[PDB]
């Protein structure tokens, strides 16, 4: 294993800081900027799409392209 699968509060905070920035957020992009692995990344992305912040471009399974507001 290459790590980047372990989950923390601190990690979450860093992820949050922040949804803003980055032209596009793609599970792939998230990993590996060395963030939480695949599923985790996806979850994070989903969360980010709750109330604004990052709006979508594509919606497909695994090809999930999102971009910053607004």
């Amino acid at each position: 294993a290459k790590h980047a699968v372990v989950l923390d509060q601190d990690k979450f905070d860093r992820i949050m800081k922040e949804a803003p920035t980055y032209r596009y957020v793609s599970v792939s992009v998230l990993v590996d900027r060395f963030k939480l692995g695949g599923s985790l990344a996806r979850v994070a992305l989903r969360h980010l799409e709750n109330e604004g912040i990052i709006k979508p471009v594509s919606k497909h399974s695994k090809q999930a392209i999102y971009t910053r507001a607004t």
């Binding site: 699968v5 372990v6 989950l7 923390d8 509060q9 979450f12 992820i15 939480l36 985790l40 979850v43 994070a44 969360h47």
Partner: protein
């Protein structure tokens, strides 16, 4: 669904049934990793327990683990059809049963011994260190145990 908030870090690698349950990953996967549990069976066990298959589950609870262990131990007591098993129909006139760890290995060994004793064609083949289920070794598998 949800990212694991809170401090976390609840034990990397758990020890269960004299074998290594791997941390994070998923309960089913852990079960599979144990010498004797497979995929479908693992899934079934998980279902019985009532835990999400989405969760990584190295942060599992103790009670849940215990329940799982119990399930592994006992086919007939819980709702498992009893033809879904590793072993079934064995000894003189009696019951179907299976193990899932070290226990499973032991059972297998016992079975092998029995076969050897019998000196059946299969048993003979086993003794030889050869091809029990009549597959043609004219060309294929040129190395062997």
């Amino acid at each position: 669904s949800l990212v694991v908030q809170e401090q976390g870090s609840f034990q990397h690698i758990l020890r269960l049934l004299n074998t290594n349950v791997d941390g994070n990953i998923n309960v089913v996967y852990a079960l599979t990793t144990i010498r004797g549990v497979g995929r479908r069976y693992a899934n079934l066990v998980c279902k019985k327990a009532d835990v999400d298959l989405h969760k990584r589950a190295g942060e599992l609870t103790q009670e849940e683990l215990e329940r799982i262990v119990q399930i592994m131990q006992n086919p007939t007591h819980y709702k498992i059809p009893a033809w879904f098993l590793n072993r079934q129909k064995d000894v003189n006139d009696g019951k179907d049963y299976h193990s899932l760890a070290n226990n499973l290995e032991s059972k297998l060994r016992d079975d092998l011994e029995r076969l050897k004793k019998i000196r059946s064609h299969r048993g003979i083949r086993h003794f030889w260190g050869l091809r029990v289920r009549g597959q043609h070794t004219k060309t294929t598998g040129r190395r062997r145990a």
